Amino acid sequence: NEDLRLHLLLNTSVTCNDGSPAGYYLKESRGSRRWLLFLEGGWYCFNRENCDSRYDTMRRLMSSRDWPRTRTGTGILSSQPEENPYWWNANMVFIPYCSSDVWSGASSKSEYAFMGALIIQEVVRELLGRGLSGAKVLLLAGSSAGGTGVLLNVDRVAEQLEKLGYPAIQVRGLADSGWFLDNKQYRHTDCVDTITCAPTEAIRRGIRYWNGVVPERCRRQFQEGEEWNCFFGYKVYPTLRCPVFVVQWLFDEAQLTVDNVHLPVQEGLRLYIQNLGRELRHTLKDVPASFAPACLSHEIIIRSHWTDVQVKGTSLPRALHCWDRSLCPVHLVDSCPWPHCNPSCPT
Amino acid sequence: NEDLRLHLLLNTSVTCNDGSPAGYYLKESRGSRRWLLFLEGGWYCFNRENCDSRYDTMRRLMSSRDWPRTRTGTGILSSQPEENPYWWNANMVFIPYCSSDVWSGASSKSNEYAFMGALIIQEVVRELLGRGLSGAKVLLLAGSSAGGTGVLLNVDRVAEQLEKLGYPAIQVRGLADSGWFLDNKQYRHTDCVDTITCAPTEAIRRGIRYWNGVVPERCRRQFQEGEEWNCFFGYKVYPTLRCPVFVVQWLFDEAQLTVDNVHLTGQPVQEGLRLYIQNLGRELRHTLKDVPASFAPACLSHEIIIRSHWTDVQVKGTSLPRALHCWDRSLCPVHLVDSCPWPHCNPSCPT
Ligand SMILES: *[C@@H]1O[C@H](CO)[C@@H](O)[C@H](O)[C@H]1NC(C)=O
Ligand SMILES: [Cl-]
Ligand SMILES: [Cl-]
Ligand SMILES: [Cl-]
Ligand SMILES: [Cl-]
C-alpha cells in the first residue's frame, strides 16, 4: 500500500497549538536513500483574537484531533511514476502544520503553544530510527508558510544532524511559494486581519507573539529586534549554507493578498502588478536554483498537475532533477511581465 | 485526555468495504465492570452503482483510511459526569461503520466491495476479551441508525459468542437508537434509484442479497427462506430476542421519512401528507406497545444516544439518561412513549 501513515510524536511536550500531539506522516521506501520531508503551509496567526478566529474556522491547522490516520501522497509526495517521474521511489514525509507560526516557534512551554521549530527537530529525531540515518539526501520541502518554514529551518536541520553525528546526510531545501517581499501595499490598510496585514507588520508582531527563532546566519546580519527581516527570502537566502531550490509564481496570490490587491482592472493597479513581478524577478536574479513562472497562482509542488507547468520548455520535476544532478537547465525565471503570459499556467 | 484510542483489527482479513482494516476505538476504565460498545450508523448501499457513488461522496463510510487516531466520547460514550451521569465511568468502545451493510455481512470471501459488518463486531468482541472484557458484568451493545438496527441483528449473536467462548457471566444487553423502522407504503412513490429514497422493504430485499447478509436465527426460522428481509424491521425481530433490548425511537425519524419520500421543506402542508404523518406516528406507537423498555418522543429528528444534548429531551417528566438508569434497575418508569402524534408536540424536542 502507498498511503503515508500517521505517527503522532512520542515526546509529550511538543504539541500543536491547542496542546494536542504534533506528528508526521511517513511512507518508507526500504530500498531508497532519498528522503522528502514536506512542511504544510496555510497562513499563521499573530495575536489572540486572530488565533481564536482561526481556531473556530480552520481548526485543522491548530489541532491534531481530527487528522486522518493515513494520507495519499500527491505531486512531489506521490509514489506514482506518472505523477512524480523522478522521485516517486523516495521515502515520503508529510508534516502537518498545526503551529500557526511559519514553523518558527521554539519555546517548549506555554495559552496557545507555538512549537513549529521543535516539531521539525522532533520529526527528524524520530526519523533517524526509521531509516533517516542511512539517507544520502534529505530534501526539506514546503508550500507557502511551509516554504518560508524551509528557509527558516533547513540549516538548523543540517546542524542538528551533524551534532547528532550523521554528517554524511546531504541536506537541501525546496521552498514553494514562501518567497515574499516586504514591500509597500498597493492601497494602504491597518493591521487587523491575517489576510490584509502588511508583510512587514505581520511578521514583526508574529515573532514576538510566537517566541519565534530565525536562522542564526541571517539573525546576526540584523540588529536585535529586527529578526523579522529573516522571514523574507531575498534577505535570508544569501546567508544560507544548504542549497535551496526556490519555486515561486511571479504573481503569487498570497503576496497580492497581503499587498492588499483585491480582484475589471484599474490602470494604477496594472502598473503595480507589473512592478511586483519585476521586483520578484530582481530578487531571483542571483538565485541559481529557481523556477519562477509568470502566473497568478499559489503553491504547486504537491498539486497533481505540478508536472504540466513549464518555464522555457522545462517542467518543474525536470528542473529539480537537473538541480539534483548539478549537485539541463536550472535557473528558470520568466522574463514575461504579465499574469497568464505563460501558456502552462494552471486553470 | 479521556479520548478513545484507535485499535485496528489484528486479523486483517476482516475489513471495511474497500479492503482497509476495520477496527474500534477504546477507553479503558479498569475500576469498572460495565462495557458500552457503540455501533455507528449512516445508511448503506445495495448495489454497485450506489456503492460507487457512496465511495466518491462518502468515502469515510467505506474505508478506515481517514479515521483519526483518537476520538472524544460523546453522550452515552462521554466520560464527563455531567454529560453522562450514570455511565461516565464505563469501559467505552466506538465501532465505526465502514461496511455499508447495516452490520449484517457475514461473508469473508469477495473486483468487489467486501461486506463484513457482523464479522467486524465478532472480531471486536474477541479482541476486547484480552483487554479487560473477560472480567465484565455487563456488555451493552448500543447503536444509532443503521447501528441501531445492527444492534437488533447482532445482540443475540454476541451473547452466543460469549457463552461459547466460556464467559457466561457477562450480561449482554441491547440499546437500539433510531433503528426501529416501518416496512410501509411510501407517501409518494419513487423508483428505487437513490439509496436514501428507495422504499424500505425494497432496499433491504436488494441489500440482503447484495451483502450476503445474515439475520438472527430465531427471527429467521419464522419466515420463508428468501424472505429474511423481514428481520431488519424492529417490530418483527424484537419478539424473538433473548437478550433484553431498550428501544429509543423518535416517532418521526428523518430517515424513515426520507425512505418514505416525505420532504418537510416548510410552507403549507397538504391534507394527504398530514394524514400520512399522523398514521406514521400511530403505527410507530402501536409497534412499541409490547416493548416494555422504550423511549419514544414525538419529535422530528434522527439519532440521540451519542449526541451531547441527549440529556435534554423528556417524556412524561423523565429524561433518557434516567429512563436507561431505571431499566438498569429493573434488571422509575421504563415505558415512555408520547401519545400526541405530531412532530414537536413535545416541548423538549431538539432544535
Ligand atoms: C481472525 O484471526 C483470529 C486469530 O488468528 C481467528 O481466531 C479468527 O477466527 C479470525 N476471524 C476470521 C473472521 O477469520
Ligand atoms: Cl510503525
Ligand atoms: Cl490537485
Ligand atoms: Cl538528463
Ligand atoms: Cl495497546
From Swiss-Prot, chain B:
The chain holds residues 86 to 451 of 496 of the full protein. One of its GO terms (biological process) is negative regulation of canonical Wnt signaling pathway. Belongs to the pectinacetylesterase family. Notum subfamily. Its EC number is 3.1.1.98. Rarely expressed in adult normal tissues. The keyword Transferase does not apply. It comes from Homo sapiens (Human). Glycans are attached at N11. It is found in: Secreted. Keywords: Glycoprotein, Hydrolase, Phosphoprotein, Secreted, Serine esterase, Signal, Wnt signaling pathway. GO terms for molecular function: palmitoleyl hydrolase activity; phospholipase C activity; protein-containing complex destabilizing activity. This is Palmitoleoyl-protein carboxylesterase NOTUM. One of its GO terms (cellular component) is endoplasmic reticulum lumen. The active site is at S145 (charge relay system), D253 (charge relay system), H302 (charge relay system). It catalyses: [Wnt protein]-O-(9Z)-hexadecenoyl-L-serine + H2O = [Wnt protein]-L-serine + (9Z)-hexadecenoate + H(+). The keyword Secreted applies. Induction: Up-regulated in hepatocellular carcinoma (HCC) with high intracellular beta-catenin. Transmembrane segments: none annotated. Carboxylesterase that acts as a key negative regulator of the Wnt signaling pathway by specifically mediating depalmitoleoylation of WNT proteins. Serine palmitoleoylation of WNT proteins is required for efficient binding to frizzled receptors. It comes from the Eukaryota.
